[PDB]
Amino acid sequence: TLPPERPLTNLQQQIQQLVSRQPNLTAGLYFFNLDSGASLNVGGDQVFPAASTIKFPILVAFFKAVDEGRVTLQERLTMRPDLIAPEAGTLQYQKPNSQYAALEVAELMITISDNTATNMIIDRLGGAAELNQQFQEWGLENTVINNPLPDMKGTNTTSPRDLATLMLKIGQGEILSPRSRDRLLDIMRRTVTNTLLPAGLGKGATIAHKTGDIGIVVGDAGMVDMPNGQRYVAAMMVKRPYNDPRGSELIRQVSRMVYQAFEKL
């Protein structure tokens, strides 16, 4: 049974003052404590370019198909010329029309944010329209795939609240089977990009999450277990001038602020 949302007004005001004083940054964030109900929403409902954070919803859709016998973990996926994308990933250096186990592809999509792997999954699951429908079914309202990855131009959309609320659902054991849930959380704890939200956590805390960076937007979303027994979900997105370190630093500062507040409470 999940407590009622209970906004920490004072922490929320502090965070609001911190984001608003940064010229040329536009930030949105949502945190929810599963034990206390403590919430923070500073622009958490606003729509952002998703960047790679969209790979987290695609992962859930993947495992949904597995659960429903529509995809198998071991079946061979083809890296067709038309699925090959630049930027992050290792699959792009392999021979065109070589093949990979579906689970290997799904893992690469998340752990190293492989854009080729991602377009292979989007294709395997029936395309952008099909996935968009699924996202709406889960209550994601502004989570929308418009173009293939890496989508440098920022056309694919989501919201901090969408990303956190899906993770809350998964955390509480909704949508996916037990086995698929536990696989997804394992995968999400082995990403190589841990410089945003995890950088604000204290010693011994763990986090399942997924980052995104297209230069003009940086973000991160997932779920934190604190050594005191507490759990919360977290999502933050920042619009910035191209590669501005201040955008990434802001995410660390807000992560730190929230983590420390929950230790006190």
Ligand X SMILES: *C(=O)[C@@H](NC(=O)Cc1ccccc1)[C@@H]1N[C@@H](C(=O)O)C(C)(C)S1
| Interface segment toward ligand X; rule CB under 6 A; list 100-108, 124-132, 133-141, 207-215 | 207-215
Q: Are 187 and 59 spatial neighbours (Cβ–Cβ below 8 Å)?
A: yes
Please select the residue that binds ligand X; options are 11, 51, 65, 79, rule is CB under 6 A.
51
Q: Residue 255 interacts with ligand X (CB under 6 A)?
A: no
Please select the residue that binds ligand X; options are 44, 49, 171, 212, rule is CB under 6 A.
212
Q: Residue 213 interacts with ligand X (CB under 6 A)?
A: yes
Nearest residue (CB) to ligand X, 33 versus 248? 248
Nearest residue (CB) to ligand X, 113 versus 255? 113
Q: What are the residues facing 209 on neighbouring strands?
A: 222
Instruction: Give CA–CA dist 48/189, Å, rounded.
Output: 24
User: Cβ of residue 89: shortest distance to ligand X, in angstroms?
Assistant: 8
Q: Are 92 and 48 spatial neighbours (Cβ–Cβ below 8 Å)?
A: no
Q: Are 108 and 91 spatial neighbours (Cβ–Cβ below 8 Å)?
A: yes
| Strand segments (E) across the chain | 6-7, 26-33, 38-42, 48-49, 76-78, 99-101, 157-158, 206-213, 217-225, 231-239
Q: Residue 249 interacts with ligand X (CB under 6 A)?
A: no
Q: Residue 116 interacts with ligand X (CB under 6 A)?
A: no
Instruction: Give CA–CA dist 263/227, Å, rounded.
Output: 9
Question: CB nearest ligand X: which residue?
Answer: 52
Cis peptide before 245 (omega within 30 of 0): no
Segment 52-71, which members bind ligand X (CB under 6 A)? 52
Helix or strand (DSSP H, E) at 161: helix 160-171
Q: Residue 144 interacts with ligand X (CB under 6 A)?
A: no
For 196, 224, 259, the CA distances from 228, given in Å and listed in that order, are 22, 11, 11
Site string for ligand X, 177-196 (x = CB under 6 A): ----------------x---
User: Cβ of residue 143: shortest distance to ligand X, in angstroms?
Assistant: 15
Size of the site for ligand X (CB under 6 A): 13
Could you list the residues that contact ligand X (CB under 6 A)?
A: 51-52, 87-88, 113, 115, 150, 193, 211-215
